[PDB]
């Protein structure tokens, strides 16, 4: 697989810190990764969170980085949900572009305990 | 907004030719677009169908181009489901990439009658 992620199923309580990982294997100095999010409930378009690379990090306009941040270390990309909100529940995943193809990591689901 | 799509809800019968459209709105520059798909059931990662641009079109490895194809005409991008199958039901959308940011169109749902 192109990506290796941290456990795909996560339970978090309100206010907890959640840390997600996607490793892009077989990488180079140009390797970049974008964190995306999809809401629970009805199917709806993904939301861009941030783009990470050695030379440039770019967060989405309107992203509150006090609650959601991320970083690159070597070939690992991380997303941190600092103070888990009810509306932070959903599906997080990485996206990587190579030769005109968009690649996606498996979903990492993060939900409150039922 | 950045995208305009054909009707977001489509009802189709088996064997019907279904044609979807996403228009990239403020084309200041040259535009490109990738057609993506999400399965209707359990939430899981989107599937890349094809990338469309002036200088390169790229279909996903494995894509049956006899059932699914697409093209670019100026800032309009189209996806054609040539002979609608049960397995073609689901959610279709576009993304484009600009200045390290991924943008997505609204979802277009295509389903058989109840």
Numbering used by the authors:
A (entry chain A), B (entry chain B): 1 to 114
From the article:
Here, we report the high-resolution crystal structures of chicken, swine and bovine CD8α and confirm that they are capable of forming homodimers.
Three extracellular Ig-like domains of chicken, swine and bovine CD8α (cCD8α, sCD8α and bCD8α) were crystallized and diffracted to 2.0 Å, 1.8 Å and 1.8 Å, respectively. The sheets of CD8α are composed of 10 β strands, but there are 11 β strands in sCD8α and bCD8α because their A and G strands are divided into two separate parts. The two artiodactyl CD8αα dimers also have some distinct structural characteristics, and the most notable feature is that they have an additional A’ strand. The two artiodactyl sCD8αα can be discriminated from each other by certain characteristics, such as the longer A’ strand and shorter complementarity determining region 2 (CDR2) loop in sCD8αα. The buried surface areas (BSAs) of cCD8αα, sCD8αα, bCD8αα, mouse CD8αα (mCD8αα), rhesus macaque CD8αα (rCD8αα) and human CD8αα (hCD8αα) are 828.3 Å2, 979.6 Å2, 928.7 Å2, 1048.7 Å2, 1105.5 Å2 and 1026.3 Å2, respectively, indicating that they are tightly binding dimers. Especially for chicken, the four conserved aromatic residues contribute 161 VDW and 262.21 Å2 BSA, which account for 42% and 34% of the total VDW and BSA, respectively. The numbers of residues composing the cCD8αα, sCD8αα and bCD8αα cavities are 7, 7 and 9, and their volumes are 202.0 Å3, 322.9 Å3 and 384.6 Å3, respectively.
